[PDB]
Amino acid sequence: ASAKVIEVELNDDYFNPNVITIPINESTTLLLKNKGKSEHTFTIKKLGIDVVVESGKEKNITVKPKSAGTYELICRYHLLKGMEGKVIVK
């Protein structure tokens, strides 16, 4: 099991990277860094993830997906401006 923390930048108004891959049946720590001037969310509904991150702040979350597939990542505030991504569990 990797000690690697997966880092995701939230900026105005996009995720970087906008595709991430995490291992099935393992705990992965994600470091969510909001480098933008707006509040953003990191939301993966089908994985039960919904995190709000203040501008200039970061949060760690731990995810342990049990089903392989490609899951929708969105920011709830900016979905219509293209702030979405794909989270691949394999």
The neighbouring-strand residues paired with 72 are 86
Q: How far apart are CA 48 and CA 54, in angstroms?
A: 20
Phi, psi at 46, each rounded to 5°: -75, -10
Q: Considering only residues 2 through 61, tell me which ones interact with Zn ion, judged by CB under 5 A.
A: 13, 38, 40
Name which of 26 and 50 has its Cβ closer to its own copies. 50
Cβ distance 27 to 63 under 8 Å? yes
The yes or no reply on residue 77 touching Zn ion (CB under 5 A) is yes
The b-or-e profile of 40-54 (16+ CB within 10 A means b, else e) is: bbbbbeebebeebbe
- Partner in contact with 53, chosen from its own copies, Zn ion, none, beta carbon below 5 to 8 Å by kind: none
Please state the closest distance from residue 63 (CB atom) to its own copies, in A: 24
Q: Considering only residues 57 through 76, tell me which ones interact with Zn ion, judged by CB under 5 A.
A: 72, 75
- Partner in contact with 80, chosen from its own copies, Zn ion, none, beta carbon below 5 to 8 Å by kind: its own copies
Binding site for its own copies (CB under 8 A): 12-13, 37-39, 55, 76-78, 80-81
40 is annotated as contributing to ligand binding: yes
